[PDB]
Design a protein around this nucleic acid. Sequence first.
DNA 1: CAACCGAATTCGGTTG
DNA 2: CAACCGAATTCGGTTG
Lengths: 87, 87
Amino acid sequence: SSATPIVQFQGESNCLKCFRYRLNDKHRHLFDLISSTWHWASPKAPHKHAIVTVTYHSEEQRQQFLNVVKIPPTIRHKLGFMSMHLL
Amino acid sequence: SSATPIVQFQGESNCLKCFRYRLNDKHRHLFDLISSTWHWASPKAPHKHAIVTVTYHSEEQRQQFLNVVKIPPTIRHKLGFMSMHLL
DNA sequence: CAACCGAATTCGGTTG
DNA sequence: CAACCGAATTCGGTTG
């Protein structure tokens, strides 16, 4: 469909920073776009973590990425989709 | 569906900041979650703008929001969806 | 891996 | 409205 398959990363803001750096330096091919480290800005916040979005070409590149990549355990992730539209 | 109906805002980073502040101060009811001001971090960047995501309860609150809200013209937006999942 | 570097951005809020 | 406040966060990159 018009859903870009993506992975969201929550966790300490500095970790994600470097995780991003790690990803750009060694894994450019395994994903597509990587976001700066953001977070939810209102007091209506569901959590408190920092976040990095990472986008993918195919549900398959995503899945491939996941097998190769050793995500630090202080970092949790979720899978989802957003409109490609918005990249 | 588990698509959270959302609006993305591109534009100068400082504008969005205040726009966010404006939204929280006067419009808390018209939307749901508002993001900090992020941007796409790799050199593989589709653009250059800063971004704020804003999420919604219903496709209807979204649409309602849009009629009431006078978005500064230096600020462009897109409509989309992301997994609710991910908020 | 993340704590740390010093430099650069962004923060929330205020004001013209 | 966005430029400006000074303070606090985040940047990319370097290290142990």
